[PDB]
């Protein structure tokens, strides 16, 4: 029932390994903010508005995937008006781009040379992952090499 549906919302979004009084106190805040609101254009169009903002930043087939999935999702409309508010807030290969040597019915458009320099940034991203990792190994120990006895260690606290 509905007095449990906010509490189960409270449990799943709380991880684990006080925090045993906090669940029961946070369902109180869940009801206390339910009735702050209650005292005081279709649904699919907002999804079309976010897919447009995908298309401006590139990634066309992804926006086409969003819309082919919401055309069958018309068969829930009160869920999407909530979904669009949590689509901006987050947590706190293919070979057919530049290949014509496959198929038999394969396009002729010749060269590109307008994002083939951004086909080398495709490799710059991969090397920039594996160089940011070696930057996150040298700092987590350089914070250790300069330290003092028992300032972060509670073993001196015994």
């Amino acid at each position: 029932s509905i007095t449990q549906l906010f509490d189960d919302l409270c449990e799943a979004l709380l991880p684990a390994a006080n925090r045993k009084r906090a669940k029961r106190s946070l369902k109180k805040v869940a009801y206390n903010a339910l009735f702050t609101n209650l005292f005081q254009l279709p649904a699919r169009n907002k999804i079309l508005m976010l897919s447009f903002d995908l298309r401006v930043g590139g990634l066309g087939p992804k926006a086409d995937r969003l819309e082919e999935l919401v055309e069958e999702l018309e068969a829930v409309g009160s869920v999407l008006d909530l979904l669009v508010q949590l689509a901006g807030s987050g947590p706190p290969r293919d070979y057919f781009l530049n290949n014509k040597h496959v198929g038999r019915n394969v396009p002729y458009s010749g060269y590109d040379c307008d994002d083939l320099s951004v086909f080398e940034m495709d490799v710059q991203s991969l090397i920039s992952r594996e160089e940011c990792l070696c930057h996150s190994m040298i700092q987590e120990t350089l914070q250790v090499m300069e330290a003092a006895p028992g300032t972060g260690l509670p073993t001196v606290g015994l």
Partner: protein, 116 residues
């Protein structure tokens, strides 16, 4: 404005029908204008002025071809707009006769000699 809803404003401008009365034309427009919204061409209000002249000469009104030349002077006299190319190239795109060939006439660079 925000560019996503600004299209729907145009769609409700031409036909006054609601955005819940039709949803396929509106979807067709989010299909067409997105991935063709940011320019991939090099801008020139110069070249577009030199064909706006060629359009109004083709309608054989030479004084109005000199009236546009003054209106274009006013446009620079204010300086409240950044992209003065786009709207004139737009109004040129929607040209119509009130009363051939074009590939041998100047068009801009499609960024096949410049890439970032």
């Amino acid at each position: 404005k925000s560019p996503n809803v600004l299209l729907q404003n145009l769609c409700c401008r031409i036909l006054g029908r609601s955005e819940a009365d039709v949803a396929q034309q509106f979807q067709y427009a989010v299909r067409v204008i997105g991935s063709n919204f940011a320019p991939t061409v090099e801008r020139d209000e110069f070249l577009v002025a030199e064909k706006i002249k060629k359009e109004l000469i083709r309608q054989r009104r030479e004084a109005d071809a000199a009236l546009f030349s003054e209106l274009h002077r006013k446009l620079h006299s204010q300086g409240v707009l950044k992209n003065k190319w786009s709207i004139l190239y737009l109004l040129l795109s929607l040209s119509e006769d009130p009363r051939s060939y074009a590939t041998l006439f100047a068009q801009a660079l499609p960024r096949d000699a410049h890439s970032t």
